[PDB]
Every structure is written in structure tokens, then in C-alpha cells.
């Protein structure tokens, strides 16, 4: 849905569908892009309703360069979340390691539904989408725990 001033990606909407005059399906004009790299396009990009300027599977955002991994911290920001990459920095003097981390804010495509805090996620380098975001959510790996559990109500 569009609840803003306009959203319409590239594909020409009006194929003069009154050739007999009929209701019909109208989800047919959807742009569909493979990123390649052996990473499967999810089917939410196939049968979605959303129009996103910055989605890697709908927009013109190419994917190149580096492929990193992190874990989801927060989701408060609109269509973009904040991941955290831990690692081990070496010191030559003491000859053992220490932990460090640098929080990366990454653009989250809305096709990746149910993306609960704590999962290992994979990101790819892009062009600068915004001021602090330079990566894009490539593939969500885990649900971080058990999907199967259910509680009362």
C-alpha cells in the first residue's frame, strides 16, 4: 500500500487493460531482481505489496564488495535495524586477545519478516543509502532459539 505521497518503482502500470473490460488480478506489474551470488530471493519479493526504494530485491540497490555477519540488537528505527559484530583484536605485547565491537546500522528490507532480536544475520556492502547506513540485510540465517515453543494465549 501507499500511505505516503507516492510509491511506484519502475514498471509501467497501465497496459490499457480495458480490451474487453474486466476486473482481473493487478499484482502482475511487479519488478523482480536476482542479486545473484548464490543467495536465493525470498518469495515475499515475488508476491509482496510493498514498494521500497532501498530493497535489494526490488530497488536499484546493487550489492558488491564485502559480506559480513552480525547479530540484531534493536528494531526501533523504520525499515532499518542495528547489528553488532564481535571480534577478537590481537595485541603483540601481551600476546593474547581482547573483545571489541562496532555497532553497524543496516537497512532492513521488509521482505525478511519475523526477524526477532538475537539472530545471526548476514549483510552486504552497498552504495551509501543514508548518512550512517552503508550495508544491506542480505540473508537472515537463524530464528535464535526455538520456533516451536508456545505459551498461554
Amino acid at each position: 500500500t501507499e500511505r505516503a505521497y507516492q510509491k511506484q518503482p519502475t514498471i509501467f502500470q497501465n497496459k490499457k487493460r480495458v480490451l474487453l473490460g474486466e476486473t482481473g488480478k493487478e499484482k502482475l506489474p511487479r519488478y523482480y531482481k536476482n542479486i545473484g551470488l548464490g543467495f536465493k530471493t525470498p518469495k515475499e519479493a515475488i508476491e509482496g505489496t510493498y514498494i521500497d526504494k532501498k530493497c535489494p530485491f526490488t530497488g536499484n540497490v546493487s550489492i558488491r564488495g564485502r559480506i559480513l555477519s552480525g547479530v540484531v540488537t534493536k528494531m526501533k528505527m523504520q525499515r532499518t535495524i542495528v547489528i553488532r559484530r564481535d571480534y577478537l583484536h590481537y595485541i603483540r605485547k601481551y600476546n593474547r586477545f581482547e573483545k571489541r565491537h562496532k555497532n553497524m546500522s543496516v537497512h532492513l528490507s521488509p521482505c525478511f519478516r519475523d526477524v526477532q532480536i538475537g539472530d545471526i544475520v548476514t549483510v552486504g556492502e552497498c552504495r551509501p543509502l543514508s548518512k550512517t547506513v552503508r550495508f544491506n540485510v542480505l540473508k537472515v540465517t537463524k530464528a535464535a532459539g526455538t520456533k516451536k515453543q508456545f505459551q498461554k494465549f
Partner: protein
């Protein structure tokens, strides 16, 4: 004077970043030409790489494309409604890349005639003008050729354009940058987006 440098900003965190340049040459920011709707006036600007770039102070004509039937005609710009990014520029009558323009319906009337006879939008007058419509009389198989164009494909414009053409105006979205390329190019609204923007304009007349 205006520089659009990113280094006078704060950081990722928000600490103040110390300046160490002096707003160098390759980050020029030039003042914006608010493109009016008057008779044609375009200045040039020398740009890095020697490429000539055009400021348009006011434009009148523009290149616009009908959607479905694929027509493209040089047409005058009349009125500007619903910029949808800043409502100041509506009253200012400024043309930008995404802006919605009323367009004289006349240079599509003669095309729709000349390819698509028994045209539309003639105020139901029926004695008015010499419309070389029926005079040519269409002797050979060209009549059946135009009849398959006109009634088998049925040439209908999905209401929304009937009511615009009997009032003689047309809604089109700009699709080029008048401050950059000096041309007010654009495409005519059709169907879904047309009734969407018409709903927004009726809401503007409401509140």
C-alpha cells in the same frame, strides 16, 4: 559560498568534528533556480569537467508522454497543483522533478483525431467546426484498418480522462530536473495514480 560538505556534520555518535579544510573547490553548492512558468529563459553554468549545465529560470513548453497509446507532444504548461513535498512551491509555481502539472489538452485532440477518428471532448456541440473527420470518407481498406484500431481495441480512456478532456486539461507528472537539464519532461497520469492524486487534490480543496 554554500558548500555541501559532509565534514561539518557531527559523527555517528554526535561528538563535534574539528574542521581542518577550508571548504574546498570540488564541493561547490550553487544557489537554486526556482523554475517559474513564464516564457523561456535559461542561463548556463560552467561545471567541473567543462560540461555545460543549464539553469532554467522559467519554462513554458515541455515534452510530455501519454501513457497507454504512446503519444509524445510538445505542449504548453498551464498550472501547477500538489507538489506533495513542499506546499510553498505550489503557490510559488515552481517546477521540480516530482511535480504535478496541468497541461493543455489540445495537442492530444488532433493526434487522437488523426490516428483515431470519431474523437472525444467536443463539448457535445455537433454543429461546431470543420473536422475533416467525415470529409475524407475513407475509401479503401484503410477504413476497416482504422475501425479495428478504433472499436476492436475500442480506444477507451477509462473515464478519468473523459472528464478531464471535456473540461480540457490534463494531469501529468514531471520526470526530469528543470534546474539541471533545462527541459520540463514528463508523463501523463493514468488510472490508479490519477485517481490517487485527484483524491489528494479534492482533500486539499476540502481541508
Amino acid at each position: 559560498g554554500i558548500s555541501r560538505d559532509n565534514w561539518h556534520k557531527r559523527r555517528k555518535t554526535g561528538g563535534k568534528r574539528k574542521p581542518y579544510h577550508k571548504k574546498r573547490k570540488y564541493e561547490l553548492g550553487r544557489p537554486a533556480a526556482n523554475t517559474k512558468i513564464g516564457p523561456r529563459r535559461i542561463h548556463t553554468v560552467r561545471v567541473r569537467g567543462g560540461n555545460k549545465k543549464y539553469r532554467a529560470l522559467r519554462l513554458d513548453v515541455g515534452n510530455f508522454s501519454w501513457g497507454s497509446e504512446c503519444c509524445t507532444r510538445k505542449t504548453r504548461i498551464i498550472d501547477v497543483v500538489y507538489n506533495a513535498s513542499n506546499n510553498e512551491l505550489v503557490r510559488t509555481k515552481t517546477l521540480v522533478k516530482n511535480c504535478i502539472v496541468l497541461i493543455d489538452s489540445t495537442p492530444y485532440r488532433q493526434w487522437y483525431e488523426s490516428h483515431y477518428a470519431l474523437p472525444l471532448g467536443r463539448k457535445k456541440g455537433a454543429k461546431l467546426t470543420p473536422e475533416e473527420e467525415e470529409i475524407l470518407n475513407k475509401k479503401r481498406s484503410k477504413k476497416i484498418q482504422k475501425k479495428y484500431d478504433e472499436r476492436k481495441k475500442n480506444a477507451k480512456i477509462s473515464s478519468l480522462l473523459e472528464e478531464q478532456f471535456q473540461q480540457g486539461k490534463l494531469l501529468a507528472c514531471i520526470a526530469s530536473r528543470p534546474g539541471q537539464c533545462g527541459r520540463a519532461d514528463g508523463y501523463v497520469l493514468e488510472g490508479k495514480e490519477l485517481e490517487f492524486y485527484l483524491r489528494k487534490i479534492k482533500a486539499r480543496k476540502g481541508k
